[PDB]
Design an enzyme around this catalytic site. Sequence first.
Site, PDB file in Angstrom:
ATOM      1  CG  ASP A  11      -3.097   1.948  -2.972  1.00 15.51           C
ATOM      2  OD1 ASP A  11      -3.921   2.258  -2.082  1.00 15.51           O
ATOM      3  OD2 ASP A  11      -3.261   1.003  -3.769  1.00 15.51           O
ATOM      4  CE  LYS A  14      -5.932   8.189  -1.677  1.00 10.21           C
ATOM      5  NZ  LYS A  14      -4.948   7.262  -2.329  1.00 10.21           N
ATOM      6  N   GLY A  38      -7.928   2.069   1.428  1.00  8.61           N
ATOM      7  CA  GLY A  38      -7.122   1.683   2.562  1.00  8.61           C
ATOM      8  C   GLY A  38      -6.033   2.718   2.725  1.00  8.61           C
ATOM      9  CG  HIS A  39      -6.774   6.266   2.916  1.00  8.30           C
ATOM     10  ND1 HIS A  39      -7.625   7.350   2.838  1.00  8.30           N
ATOM     11  CD2 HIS A  39      -6.821   5.667   1.702  1.00  8.30           C
ATOM     12  CE1 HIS A  39      -8.171   7.394   1.636  1.00  8.30           C
ATOM     13  NE2 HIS A  39      -7.699   6.383   0.927  1.00  8.30           N
ATOM     14  CD  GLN A 214     -11.460   4.728  -4.146  1.00  3.51           C
ATOM     15  OE1 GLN A 214     -12.295   5.643  -4.191  1.00  3.51           O
ATOM     16  NE2 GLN A 214     -11.354   3.897  -3.106  1.00  3.51           N
TER      17      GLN A 214
END
Lengths: 410, 410
Positions: A11, A14, A38-39, A214
């Site tokens: 988080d 990215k 989750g991006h 990650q």
Amino acid sequence: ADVVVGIQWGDEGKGKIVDRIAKDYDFVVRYQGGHNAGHTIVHKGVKHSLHLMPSGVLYPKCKNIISSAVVVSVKDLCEEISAFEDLENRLFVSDRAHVILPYHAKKDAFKEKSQNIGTTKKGIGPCYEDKMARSGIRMGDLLDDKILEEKLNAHFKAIEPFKKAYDLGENYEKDLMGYFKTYAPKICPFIKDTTSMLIEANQKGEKILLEGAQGTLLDIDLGTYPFVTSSNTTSASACVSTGLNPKAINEVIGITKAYSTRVGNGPFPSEDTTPMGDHLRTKGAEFGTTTKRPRRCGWLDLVALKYACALNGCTQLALMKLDVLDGIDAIKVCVAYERKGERLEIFPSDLKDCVPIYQTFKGWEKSVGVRKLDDLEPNVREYIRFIEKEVGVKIRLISTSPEREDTIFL
Amino acid sequence: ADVVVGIQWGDEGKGKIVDRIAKDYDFVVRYQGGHNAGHTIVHKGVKHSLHLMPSGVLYPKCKNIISSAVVVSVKDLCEEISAFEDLENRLFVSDRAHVILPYHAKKDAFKEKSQNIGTTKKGIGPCYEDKMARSGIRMGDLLDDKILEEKLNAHFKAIEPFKKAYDLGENYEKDLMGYFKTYAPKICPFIKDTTSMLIEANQKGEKILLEGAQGTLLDIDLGTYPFVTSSNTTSASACVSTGLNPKAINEVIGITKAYSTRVGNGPFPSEDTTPMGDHLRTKGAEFGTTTKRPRRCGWLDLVALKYACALNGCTQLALMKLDVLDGIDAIKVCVAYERKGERLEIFPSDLKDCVPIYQTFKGWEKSVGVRKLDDLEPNVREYIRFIEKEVGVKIRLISTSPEREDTIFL
Ligand SMILES: Nc1nc2c(ncn2[C@@H]2O[C@H](COP(=O)(O)OP(=O)(O)O)[C@@H](O)[C@H]2O)c(=O)[nH]1
Ligand SMILES: Nc1nc2c(ncn2[C@@H]2O[C@H](COP(=O)(O)OP(=O)(O)O)[C@@H](O)[C@H]2O)c(=O)[nH]1
Ligand SMILES: O=P(O)(O)OC[C@H]1O[C@@H](n2cnc3c(OP(=O)(O)O)ncnc32)[C@H](O)[C@@H]1O
Ligand SMILES: O=P(O)(O)OC[C@H]1O[C@@H](n2cnc3c(OP(=O)(O)O)ncnc32)[C@H](O)[C@@H]1O
Ligand SMILES: O=CN(O)CC(=O)O
Ligand SMILES: O=CN(O)CC(=O)O
Ligand SMILES: [Mg+2]
Ligand SMILES: [Mg+2]
């Protein structure tokens, strides 16, 4: 090929960085993890929260690749596909990627009762377990009905003793056959030999961007085990299973926030549990992109950052979320650990008894939305200079809001 | 750092090459696999069959490192240690390496009844499974009795439903506590933070050699799944979990035999099942260094070799066991695959229906023991030239017997 890697516990921003730079690449490649990721991309007031879809999806000329070391929830990937137009010929899923079955998420939830890792409960770990067991189903198996049926039949036999323990449905077997009858036709056109695609792309000199998920401290081998994800998250993981090799890696862009977060359990030396940590959570909107869990917040930790930079070979850094610190009078940075009267300058393999030693920096007021280094307040630039000096890597991207264009390039 | 990788299905001659070149390095590092590996060194009529011990052990000035992505049978490693003098301060075992428990080998043997992969039955896969589950025990846990006891107690609870199924002893629990009381004191002095050691060694410019185990076609992601080992075997695996990064990799030496072998089940397009294959097995003494199983023998496969070279980024090749082909009138090399009337020049993700297309080379009579290129028969050098041209990588080492000194350097 260039690699974007998070150098903290995920988080870091990215998705934003990949989307900001993807226009200049021919391929954007997700290479590990699953939909635990989750991006978040924001552009012109529109937010996309991607999970397995690579973050080049907003540039139709890019080819987005989901590579072999990923674990794929087919239903969830199909739901992501439905949000974009004409993904045929710009999204490709490796025929060697492993398939997450509903059993995996149920097993994840069950083992979490006793392990208390704080996983995303998406079945990532159990899917990687079946990969190591060499019993896992791969995406290529979906292309042949007879092969899929044989593998599903073995799966039904293998899991029978866990039906009650894992709260598996009594119609688990018929439901799973129907699951693949629904979703295999939707996903099958996207399944390709992406290893050969990237071997060829590298040989031809095409521009390849690899998008990590990650972060380094969640690496299964070198992170804060057992409070880690079940994949390797360092930049070398981008050339283990994609069809590239280590000699092909050019730029390694390490993504770091101006402070720290992690979500889930595990050591966090620079965690701030006072109301200042709660302020970072509120102003930074620090809730899991995937799970919505409140993130644990704390200060930037340069001991951990130097370790992650060494493992990745970072050639540039992107410093994110400077704007969240607007208005805070004093910014702390963990520069060393105290452990039983010992000062540690190097990240140890066990973080027990490691207490942060802080250096304090004068704060700033209004970095939000700034797009030029000239417009950043002196105290921000002093903070940036310190990080660069201590870590030994130039900060080349500075983010001052979630928006794509609120980014300074150096 | 330089990497030695096998570019076939293992047993290419990695132990010989590492031992031949190790004198010029400060560190020799095993980075993946376990004691499934068997790496044979022969010098002056004395043979050492190493399994987890790195192949720099015959040079006391080298520092041998067993890195974090390895899986460690402590009893077997202690038995290897007992064969050498004064290994203190020249052998170090990562505190992050995972520990193989007897349960793992019993589970391996049990699952093999139905999976028929042909594993070495050493418990490698099940140990990597527990790593992905994040329940595995790591070497660092052996340094604290209270931590080890808590982890063993969890293990005893976790395996209870499998006691009968896996043929676990009725004294399994008391035996395993006694196992660690016997072997932990022997191994504990060797347990170190090897990640930090190699980060520092790389920063200081020390010479590091990374020794692969298995081979590229056994890679869990990119090999002939499910007929693979449970670790990544490519050169990038050497910078995933060691403390190095991809930018640190300099030479990548791919080790290949002049023909092919694999041991265990799985596809093998160039397998020779005629008496010529049996001749290769006899003259090449092709029996597993670890399991003593007869190896499957066949011809060199350049389709597979080009694939492995691409995944590793080989900068040089070592061509091994030319002497085994002495006296064979015609040498076949698989240059392409025929599949349903289609000619494949590129290694596919599924080898079903792939039939080798052979090119034939004139044989030679007496390469055994040759130490100078000048003394190799013309037909050998023609064969070497062809391999180099097709693969695009220079052959820099040529081995003509098991002995260390029966090697040509170019
Ligand atoms: N305020 C602020 N938010 C940012 C910035 N960069 C990214 N974000 C937001 O920060 C969060 C980053 O979390 P996430 O998307 O999970 O990061 P990722 O997993 O590394 O892509 C998202 O809500 C982003 O929209 C920034 O510079 N400032
Ligand atoms: N005849 C012959 N034998 C060799 C040569 N190089 C290595 N060997 C032997 O070939 C076998 C190689 O198998 P193995 O030790 O398992 O290879 P590794 O796993 O790659 O180290 C061993 O018995 C070696 O002693 C060679 O050039 N000629
Ligand atoms: O077995 P898992 O479900 O993977 O959980 C293991 C541990 O890893 C965390 N985790 C997994 N993906 C994460 C992520 O992804 P991105 O940065 O790509 O958005 N960002 C932050 N934390 C993440 C989980 O909270 C848990 O601590
Ligand atoms: O789960 P595993 O026990 O790892 O078995 C999986 C498959 O991999 C084979 N195998 C494992 N190590 C091997 C090796 O090691 P070195 O080259 O390092 O000496 N050389 C050749 N084959 C090897 C096994 O026969 C099986 O097919
Ligand atoms: O962006 C993804 N995460 O923060 C993981 C989660 O949502 O738990
Ligand atoms: O050298 C090791 N092998 O050939 C694996 C085995 O013995 O089965
Ligand atoms: Mg995220
Ligand atoms: Mg061997």
